[PDB]
Design an enzyme around this catalytic site. Sequence first.
Site, PDB file in Angstrom:
ATOM      1  N   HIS A  60       0.840  -1.225   0.000  1.00  0.00           N
ATOM      2  CA  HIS A  60       0.000   0.000   0.000  1.00  0.00           C
ATOM      3  C   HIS A  60       0.870   1.269   0.000  1.00  0.00           C
ATOM      4  O   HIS A  60       0.756   2.092   0.881  1.00  0.00           O
ATOM      5  CB  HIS A  60      -0.980  -0.016   1.147  1.00  0.00           C
ATOM      6  CG  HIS A  60      -2.055  -1.021   0.968  1.00  0.00           C
ATOM      7  ND1 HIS A  60      -2.059  -2.202   1.675  1.00  0.00           N
ATOM      8  CD2 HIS A  60      -3.147  -1.030   0.164  1.00  0.00           C
ATOM      9  CE1 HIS A  60      -3.114  -2.899   1.316  1.00  0.00           C
ATOM     10  NE2 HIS A  60      -3.792  -2.204   0.395  1.00  0.00           N
ATOM     11  N   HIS A 100       1.530   1.544  -5.821  1.00  0.00           N
ATOM     12  CA  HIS A 100       0.109   1.092  -5.864  1.00  0.00           C
ATOM     13  C   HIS A 100      -0.805   2.260  -6.247  1.00  0.00           C
ATOM     14  O   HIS A 100      -1.666   2.092  -7.154  1.00  0.00           O
ATOM     15  CB  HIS A 100      -0.264   0.457  -4.539  1.00  0.00           C
ATOM     16  CG  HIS A 100      -1.721   0.191  -4.415  1.00  0.00           C
ATOM     17  ND1 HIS A 100      -2.324  -0.827  -5.091  1.00  0.00           N
ATOM     18  CD2 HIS A 100      -2.668   0.759  -3.645  1.00  0.00           C
ATOM     19  CE1 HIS A 100      -3.611  -0.874  -4.720  1.00  0.00           C
ATOM     20  NE2 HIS A 100      -3.833   0.081  -3.823  1.00  0.00           N
ATOM     21  N   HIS A 142      -6.112   7.348  -2.940  1.00  0.00           N
ATOM     22  CA  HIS A 142      -7.126   6.468  -2.285  1.00  0.00           C
ATOM     23  C   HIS A 142      -6.555   5.674  -1.095  1.00  0.00           C
ATOM     24  O   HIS A 142      -7.368   5.140  -0.330  1.00  0.00           O
ATOM     25  CB  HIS A 142      -7.815   5.551  -3.282  1.00  0.00           C
ATOM     26  CG  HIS A 142      -6.989   4.359  -3.598  1.00  0.00           C
ATOM     27  ND1 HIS A 142      -5.894   4.430  -4.413  1.00  0.00           N
ATOM     28  CD2 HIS A 142      -7.119   3.077  -3.254  1.00  0.00           C
ATOM     29  CE1 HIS A 142      -5.336   3.227  -4.488  1.00  0.00           C
ATOM     30  NE2 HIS A 142      -6.055   2.377  -3.780  1.00  0.00           N
ATOM     31  N   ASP A 143      -5.243   5.516  -0.966  1.00  0.00           N
ATOM     32  CA  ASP A 143      -4.610   4.781   0.184  1.00  0.00           C
ATOM     33  C   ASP A 143      -3.602   5.675   0.952  1.00  0.00           C
ATOM     34  O   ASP A 143      -2.686   5.139   1.649  1.00  0.00           O
ATOM     35  CB  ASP A 143      -3.912   3.539  -0.348  1.00  0.00           C
ATOM     36  CG  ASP A 143      -4.798   2.288  -0.426  1.00  0.00           C
ATOM     37  OD1 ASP A 143      -5.753   2.144   0.355  1.00  0.00           O
ATOM     38  OD2 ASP A 143      -4.453   1.425  -1.216  1.00  0.00           O
ATOM     39  N   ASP A 164      -8.474  -0.802  -8.059  1.00  0.00           N
ATOM     40  CA  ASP A 164      -7.751  -1.176  -6.820  1.00  0.00           C
ATOM     41  C   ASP A 164      -7.248  -2.612  -6.904  1.00  0.00           C
ATOM     42  O   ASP A 164      -6.222  -2.896  -6.270  1.00  0.00           O
ATOM     43  CB  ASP A 164      -8.697  -0.987  -5.666  1.00  0.00           C
ATOM     44  CG  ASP A 164      -7.972  -0.859  -4.366  1.00  0.00           C
ATOM     45  OD1 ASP A 164      -6.719  -0.621  -4.371  1.00  0.00           O
ATOM     46  OD2 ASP A 164      -8.681  -0.976  -3.380  1.00  0.00           O
ATOM     47  N   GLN A 219      -5.520 -17.741  -3.469  1.00  0.00           N
ATOM     48  CA  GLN A 219      -5.671 -16.909  -4.696  1.00  0.00           C
ATOM     49  C   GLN A 219      -6.900 -17.371  -5.489  1.00  0.00           C
ATOM     50  O   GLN A 219      -7.712 -16.481  -5.925  1.00  0.00           O
ATOM     51  CB  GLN A 219      -4.358 -16.879  -5.487  1.00  0.00           C
ATOM     52  CG  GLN A 219      -3.273 -16.019  -4.829  1.00  0.00           C
ATOM     53  CD  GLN A 219      -3.677 -14.557  -4.792  1.00  0.00           C
ATOM     54  OE1 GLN A 219      -3.969 -13.937  -5.811  1.00  0.00           O
ATOM     55  NE2 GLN A 219      -3.792 -14.011  -3.585  1.00  0.00           N
TER      56      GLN A 219
HETATM   57  C1  LIG Z   1      -4.285 -10.363  -5.479  1.00  0.00           C
HETATM   58  C2  LIG Z   1      -5.029  -9.623  -4.387  1.00  0.00           C
HETATM   59  N1  LIG Z   1      -5.426  -8.329  -4.570  1.00  0.00           N
HETATM   60  C3  LIG Z   1      -6.076  -7.603  -3.591  1.00  0.00           C
HETATM   61  C4  LIG Z   1      -6.379  -8.190  -2.314  1.00  0.00           C
HETATM   62  C5  LIG Z   1      -7.134  -7.426  -1.283  1.00  0.00           C
HETATM   63  N2  LIG Z   1      -6.013  -9.522  -2.158  1.00  0.00           N
HETATM   64  N3  LIG Z   1      -6.145 -10.361  -1.089  1.00  0.00           N
HETATM   65  C6  LIG Z   1      -5.581 -11.571  -1.385  1.00  0.00           C
HETATM   66  C7  LIG Z   1      -5.535 -12.734  -0.434  1.00  0.00           C
HETATM   67  C8  LIG Z   1      -6.413 -13.853  -0.954  1.00  0.00           C
HETATM   68  C9  LIG Z   1      -6.411 -14.966   0.059  1.00  0.00           C
HETATM   69  N4  LIG Z   1      -5.312 -15.670   0.419  1.00  0.00           N
HETATM   70  C10 LIG Z   1      -5.757 -16.555   1.328  1.00  0.00           C
HETATM   71  N5  LIG Z   1      -4.969 -17.462   1.996  1.00  0.00           N
HETATM   72  C11 LIG Z   1      -5.491 -18.421   2.884  1.00  0.00           C
HETATM   73  C12 LIG Z   1      -4.290 -19.181   3.294  1.00  0.00           C
HETATM   74  C13 LIG Z   1      -3.316 -19.002   2.234  1.00  0.00           C
HETATM   75  C14 LIG Z   1      -3.675 -17.713   1.583  1.00  0.00           C
HETATM   76  N6  LIG Z   1      -7.049 -16.417   1.576  1.00  0.00           N
HETATM   77  N7  LIG Z   1      -7.499 -15.446   0.753  1.00  0.00           N
HETATM   78  C15 LIG Z   1      -8.852 -14.938   0.633  1.00  0.00           C
HETATM   79  N8  LIG Z   1      -5.044 -11.494  -2.635  1.00  0.00           N
HETATM   80  C16 LIG Z   1      -5.296 -10.233  -3.096  1.00  0.00           C
HETATM   81 MG   LIG Z   2      -7.308   0.854   0.562  1.00  0.00          MG
HETATM   82 ZN   LIG Z   3      -5.651   0.429  -2.728  1.00  0.00          ZN
END
Ligand SMILES: Cc1ncc(C)n2nc(CCc3nc(N4CCCC4)nn3C)nc12
Ligand SMILES: [Mg+2]
Ligand SMILES: [Zn+2]
Length: 313
Positions: A68, A72, A106-107, A217, A269
Amino acid sequence: GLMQFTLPVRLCKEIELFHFDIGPFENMWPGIFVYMVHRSCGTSCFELEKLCRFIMSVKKNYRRVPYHNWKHAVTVAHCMYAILQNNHTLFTDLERKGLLIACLCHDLDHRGFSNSYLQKFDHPLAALYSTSTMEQHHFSQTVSILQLEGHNIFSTLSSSEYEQVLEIIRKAIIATDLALYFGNRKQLEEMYQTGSLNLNNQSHRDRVIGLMMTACDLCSVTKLWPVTKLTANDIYAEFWAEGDEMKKLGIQPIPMMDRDKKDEVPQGQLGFYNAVAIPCYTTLTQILPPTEPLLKACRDNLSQWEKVIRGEE
Ligand SMILES: Cc1ncc(C)n2nc(CCc3nc(N4CCCC4)nn3C)nc12
Ligand SMILES: [Mg+2]
Ligand SMILES: [Zn+2]
């Protein structure tokens, strides 16, 4: 006044494409942003001296966190530029003015921590702003910087146009709170399917700009695979430090923020693409058809994460 910003040929051509990466040369990012304002808004939109002073104070109020950060900000502004340039006639003069600024801001002054972590820590920002904590702070930082001497890039607007643009910026920045995205996209989907969606209705425009903000975003998932993959490392570098800080407060973090679950990143992912990204770009493409390259790239990157799971990389 007769002073264009110009970019080298490769950047001049590729900056028009949704998947453009702004590159590792930090000193070129201000010129890239000015270039984008000049083309999406016009050379007359802002006083160059004031715009340059505002960009440099915004840069100084982003912190040296893994994700952030100032890169970004400029990345999210470029995705908005690409959306605006592919939908020339859909947007007002004030919207073109406000949205690139909103994206850059925005951040602002992000600390590398979620709204959840501020609330568990009992950070002072969580008492001043009970929901969308960081996003109210980012808007507050934006107004602060606009009020510094020589930084009011909107000084040539009427007092009612000025109120309108700051209202476009406030809503655009609040909409980047991903907790608000789910219900926003659900309402937009229902409105588009029942044919009630109406872009002359201000509250509908507000929702469509909200979705544009989520799309910009999240735009790391729309890049070439090596960009997507290396950005993911920065995202987790933040989340895992927050997980560490949750454990310091005696709280098991969620899996997403627990570095012990590194091995599960590929599956995390997948969840994220299926639950957040693909639906975002799907609904955006339905409403603004020329944004389809964002959906196509997202689907390619989902398929790359599927390949990682299958040990094909
Ligand atoms: C590419 C990307 N752009 C923005 C945001 C906000 N995000 N947030 C993510 C994290 C997704 C995620 N990873 C896991 N894990 C559970 C255990 C291993 C990893 N759960 N989740 C929902 N990737 C992104
Ligand atoms: Mg934000
Ligand atoms: Zn952002």
